[PDB]
């Protein structure tokens, strides 16, 4: 049977070619985990279709309702039977899904827009000239509002009542509030997407600070699912091999353009 | 009843306290790990005996005999029941033994003697007057045995014929042999024992170069164990909680004598 593969589109992990309008199936994209499900498929021997996420959302867990959304919600309701994308191995989501060691390495940080007077966390939740947000429906949300040290819970009870909401739907909103805030917004997203957006025209954003923790993103597969053994085993396999670092540097800085 | 934790006397992980002579059972050691075994042991709900692991290894198959040693081998052959340790999440390693997601996150680097003309693996490998190893039985000694690029295999093919042997039983010997050498040895350990060195006295040493690969540390059950769930949700709780990061900065920084 084909796996049905979940996936987000999210540059430089999952993208459409240039001239995807004349291909078809997983042809379609590119990016470092359409490279990685192709590998993984390789390594665990299983033929794929990648699908992308019908509500364009990570995972988050509705609180009245208590029913996952996005790809995590794919998994839990077998809507999908592996999800390959930048999805955050967290704790509340390794309760209803399965993670596969991580794959890549990241943590919080802070985009600017070039020159505006923030050099850490600690100076945002200092003042209220510049607002700031993050992604809805994910991790580093759940973050914010779980976090009990100090500057991390300030900077929560900011961003929960603001208004207007200072929450973005995906990544590319947050990041084009941040270019056209003429530096009156600062976005919260994972080191990885900052990074990679720095060395992207116009060139007008970049990363400060250090991160403000340390994590990883995992392929995951549905609560007691035959694939789990496989496909972690494949991942260490993979990292122990150079590939995943190849890979990094083909989509990150092989591809900069600043 | 009582759960036996394998672990290694690796500072800043776990060390004898000055008077653990006159102290009983756990109270003689002092560490990240030992701070790190108590938590886990309070939210998994367990008691436990901290033990040094025999061998004074981390762990690796012998060739022939195909027996593991080190921590590793206690898991597999049963002698312990959970590892606490700066143990590396490795595809040869969870073939046997299971790990919970990483508790710190790594890589390999290179440590000199300040002011040695070395300034990354490249530097090492292209030159013969300065010699260079690393430890015995562990994931580092493997990653360059295994190594397909360039640059690591050629390291390797040095490494491995080099006379006297470049390779060390501890970490504690190596950095000694580095300080000892005058600059004619470089030493390749984890990034997270050469940033500890760096600040101590006699503040000789230097980490140089990026990290050669990205891994993990993991709480090592043996397979199909019972702890295993409880103790991976535990980690995953304590990361988010900011814990792991508090003890850290207690263990590098805080204490730090440069
Ligand atoms: C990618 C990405 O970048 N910033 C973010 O918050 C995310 C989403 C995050 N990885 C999640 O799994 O929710
Ligand atoms: C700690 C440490 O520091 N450098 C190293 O090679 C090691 C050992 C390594 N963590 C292992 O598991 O073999
Ligand atoms: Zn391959
Ligand atoms: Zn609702
Ligand atoms: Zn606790």
Redesign the pocket.
Known sequence: KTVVVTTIL?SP?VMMKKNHEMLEGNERYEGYCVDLAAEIAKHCGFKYKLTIVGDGK???RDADTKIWN?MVGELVYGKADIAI????I?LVREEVIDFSKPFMSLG?SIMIKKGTPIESAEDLSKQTEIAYG??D??????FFRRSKIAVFDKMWTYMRSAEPSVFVRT?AEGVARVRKSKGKYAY???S??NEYIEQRKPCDTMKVGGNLDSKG?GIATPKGSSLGNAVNLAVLKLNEQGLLDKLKNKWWYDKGEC
Do not use: H, N
């Not at 994308?85 to 955050?88: E, Q």
């Not at 429906?137 to 759940?142: A, C, D, L, R, Y």
């Open positions: 999210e992990y990570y995972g988050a996005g994308a930048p999805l955050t967290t919080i993050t992604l429906s994910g991790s580093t949300k759940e990544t919260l997203l994972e990885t997407m993103y």
